[PDB]
Design a protein around this ligand. Structure first.
Ligand SMILES: [Zn+2]
Ligand SMILES: [Zn+2]
Ligand SMILES: [Zn+2]
Ligand SMILES: [Zn+2]
Lengths: 151, 76, 79, 152
């Protein structure tokens, strides 16, 4: 019954995300497998990521929505909460997950993370230290990485 | 009547309530949905994250009756 | 419609017979208006007006789903 | 004062419902301007010993209504183990089994059911209760007789 419960919702979310997708976001299955998804987040307007197209890998479990989905970046980004591989340090993807949260709400939180990073809980210490000491140099590094890797 | 289906939907399964029961904070869920969450150690409300026990569950009949009232109208 | 009178049924308080104002539930699951059930609860060894199952004044829970629907039905009554 | 507006608002709702959908064989409403003081007219249940009688009742509400029950007394003499010479009704819901969910319509249906099926268990008139269980035919003859004399 594990698989039928998870599959039934994921199906409900796939209908809603297509009808009413989050602003600057797009998400759907890579193929026949409903558990393995491909998404696209456009860099928030006004942010250092402005004009970039960033791809993500959403891997659901048969225990969804009781356990969170595995959301990882492919695309390189200059962000204190996103490391070299593409691991996202977001509270709701780890120890602060609730079964009331959808994939639409998880995409909007990533867009808020891109707009306003959290240097208090850094996954890349060097970038966090830069965002607080030298803001201008942090923004110059993030725009060069967005132009190079996200275009 | 889309907004009314809104109020009889369970936050966990996103389908109309089935044995709607309430927890300490007042939020209501399907008996099966909130019971599945109750088997995970420190059980906390999926809506407001307030702490909850399964012993302290209350039937919300009014909502179960409302699900039947809206189902009769959807036939049309 | 003719079929919305059954819905007003579900949002009516058994004590005042008017739509719920600050709907709260007690131990047994039955819902009332806070002010209506607190009047019962003051009077000593109180019991539920519907099922006569005991209830404690200090064990009240807001039933927010019902309050939302009260307004959803009030919006319709204007048309 | 807020007590008065709440009881009034509830008595008002019931006056509309007891007029629209009165209980079978019952009728009531206010005696005058005073919404708290009512009078009611019950017909003796069909099939019963009270069949063919017309009984009057005095309903009196308090500003504490519906949290406290109303005062309902008989003004028409009746031969009943649960109704004394002073018209006092021995009925659970008028005493320690009152519920604020109860309406004056549900009170009256219970008086109709009390008339049809009396409770010799707790009798306000021990005499009549003893007779109902020992000599039923003589009880019924006296109730049929009392109904003709006082309720016609
Ligand atoms: Zn549910
Ligand atoms: Zn809650
Ligand atoms: Zn009330
Ligand atoms: Zn109850």
């Amino acid at each position: 019954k594990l698989l039928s419960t998870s599959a039934k919702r994921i199906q409900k979310e796939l209908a809603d995300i297509t009808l009413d997708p989050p602003p600057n976001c797009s998400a759907g299955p890579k193929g026949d497998n409903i558990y393995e998804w491909r998404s696209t987040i456009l860099g928030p307007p006004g942010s250092v990521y402005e004009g970039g197209v960033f791809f993500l890998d959403i891997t659901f479990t048969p225990e969804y929505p009781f356990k969170p989905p595995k959301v990882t970046f492919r695309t390189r980004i200059y962000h204190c909460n996103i490391n070299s591989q593409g691991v996202i340090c977001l509270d709701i993807l780890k120890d602060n997950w609730s079964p009331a949260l959808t994939i639409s709400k998880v995409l909007l939180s990533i867009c808020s993370l891109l707009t306003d990073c959290n240097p208090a809980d850094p996954l890349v210490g060097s970038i966090a230290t830069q965002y607080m000491t030298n803001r201008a140099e942090h923004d110059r590094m993030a725009r060069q990485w967005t132009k190079r890797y996200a275009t | 009547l889309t907004m009314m289906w809104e109020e009889v939907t369970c936050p966990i399964c996103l389908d109309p309530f089935v044995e709607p029961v309430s927890i300490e904070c007042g939020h209501s869920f399907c008996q099966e949905c909130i019971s599945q969450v109750g088997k995970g150690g420190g059980s906390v409300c999926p809506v407001c994250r307030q702490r909850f026990l399964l012993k302290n569950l209350r039937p919300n009949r009014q909502l179960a009756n409302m699900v039947n009232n809206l189902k009769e109208i959807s036939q049309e």
